[PDB]
């Protein structure tokens, strides 16, 4: 039960870590806060912790606690809802190729697994992530809610908690994953035997040759924050990220769009961020991010 | 003419540096931006610059240009007004013991001189200063508008541009400079032969034994952002700063206050910041900042 052992510790780990944060009074974030790493150990019969069929014996670390309560707050995630969704309702597994990929019962939170490299990375990129939120409210970047580590019998599973663009609340008729490149960028046979498959660039150019149409006001805004997100991402030497796009042929938090003659609710966000600088040229990530926006404006079309 | 040589270069230096920034389109700040140092050289007869009786021959460096346009913007300093006030109206000198202390004609900007140490410092503390603005709008900290350096015949005069709490627009009947300490913290004989002298702690405790009274709403707010500013300052290992307080016995941007029976417009802000970590204990700055607020609540009184 590699999984059930993890599944429980994560729920038990967060209840404590975040629960006990909520007794302390809130106070602004300082630079020092991004580097903190608070831990706590979870024995079977520890008074101040709890025992468990899950909690056989382990330690639970949470990175940058105070930054993440900020980030949650700024995302509008009331902590009661956070730790209800995660720790109180049986979260559910999901195949997606040692790394796991869990999801909340309410399907508003993804819990991914991440390698030591990709995790320490994220950690270093918190201050830019902060500088981003506070300057670009409509940022299509991933919404990171938390970063933790379940150290288990001499092995560390580190995990990231984040939003889940396309939640299941509103149905998705179409899903595209887009990089602005082309090579082997079709869907696998397996993938198109799904119900609402996630197509890719080449698929999009033959299946949606007419673009996805937007009114000048909505397009302007989108162009604007693509450009901005791309400038950030570029700054961090990041690449191989894609624009996940949920089409809904109609809390409609989407944009006003049109097919080749019909009303739409698109739903989009940038994904697969944590990958940068470990042999690409010094001007590669720039090229990648130009290609990106320039292409997302044969994807999202105007007038 | 050590001074007139500086006075002109500063005006000529900023016009160019900031003027030419305004042709480029605005774009968000990134962490990389805090470390940039842009320069430009000012010969007598340089086409793309200008000549000058002031500009005999010098180089002009501006630190973190893009962060400072952000900070200006956030302070509501329209750049046309910035470089009119500074570069277009004859700024005026001021004794205040090689360091000079200029002021704008309109008296809305102080131009101080700073040593290599205190300047590089400020530079390192920009990201926290950013994290502060964006989290505490009513921050009693200094408003840094710009940081530059006039390299002159093989010597660097570095200078800081900032707000000027008590401007002369509204008259100041009383001025206090307060640290929450006491030792040799009286006014010099010279100082009290001024018109509107800047008294200090001991003076304040005998001259204002009745506090400075505030209504629960206004006091709450003040307490709150003292506490917060002090937490920031503490974080940066900073001390020997004071609360400059302008009393006006009545664009009234002050707070509602009362004397021992009369209406008031107080005007306050934290000053003398750039001094930290260069032999004080690891918990000294904390002690300094506790003393501070705890004392500023025998200075600013409630109910």
Numbering used by the authors:
A (entry chain A), B (entry chain A): 57 to 153, 157 to 309, 357 to 384, 402 to 426
What did the study's authors say about this model?
The reaction catalysed by the type I PIPK, or phosphatidylinositol 4-phosphate 5-kinase (PIP5K1), is the major synthetic route for PtdIns4,5P2 in most cells. To help elucidating the mechanism for PIP5K1 regulation by DVL, we determine the X-ray structure of the kinase domain of zebrafish PIP5K1A. In this work, we present the first crystal structure of a PIP5K1 molecule. More importantly, the new crystal structure enables us to delineate two adjacent interfaces for dimerization and interaction with DVL that are unique to the PIP5K1 kinases and unravel the importance of these interfaces in regulation of the kinase enzymatic activity by dimerization and interaction with DVL.
The locations of Lys-171 (from the conserved ‘IIK' motif), Asp-299 (MDYSL) and Asp-378 (IID) in the three-dimensional structure of PIP5K1A suggest that they are functionally equivalent to Lys-72, Asp-166 and Asp-184 of PKA, which participate in ATP binding and catalysis. In PIP5K1A, the turn between β8 and α4c is compact. The side chain of Arg-244 is potentially hydrogen bonded to the main chain carbonyl oxygen and side chain carboxylate group of Asp-236, and pushes the side chain of Lys-238 into the active site. Size-exclusion chromatography/multi-angle laser light scattering (SEC/MALLS) indicates that the kinase has a molecular weight of 90 kDa, suggesting that the protein is dimeric in the solution. The crystal structure reveals that the dimer has a side-to-side arrangement, involving both N- and C-lobes of the kinase. Most residues constituting the dimeric interface are found within three structural elements: the loop between α1 and α1a, α4b, and α6. α4b is near the centre of the dimer, and interacts with its symmetric mate (α4b*) through hydrophobic contacts mediated by Pro-186, Phe-189 and Met-190. The negatively charged Asp-84* from the α1*–α1a* loop is matched against a positively charged patch (Arg-287) on α6, while Leu-86* forms hydrophobic contact with Val-291. Unfortunately, the specificity loop (zPIP5K1A residues 386–401), in which the primary determinant of substrate specificity lies28, is disordered in the PIP5K1A structure as in the PIP4K2B structure (Rao et al.), and therefore it remains difficult to rationalize the preferences of PIPKs towards different lipid substrates.
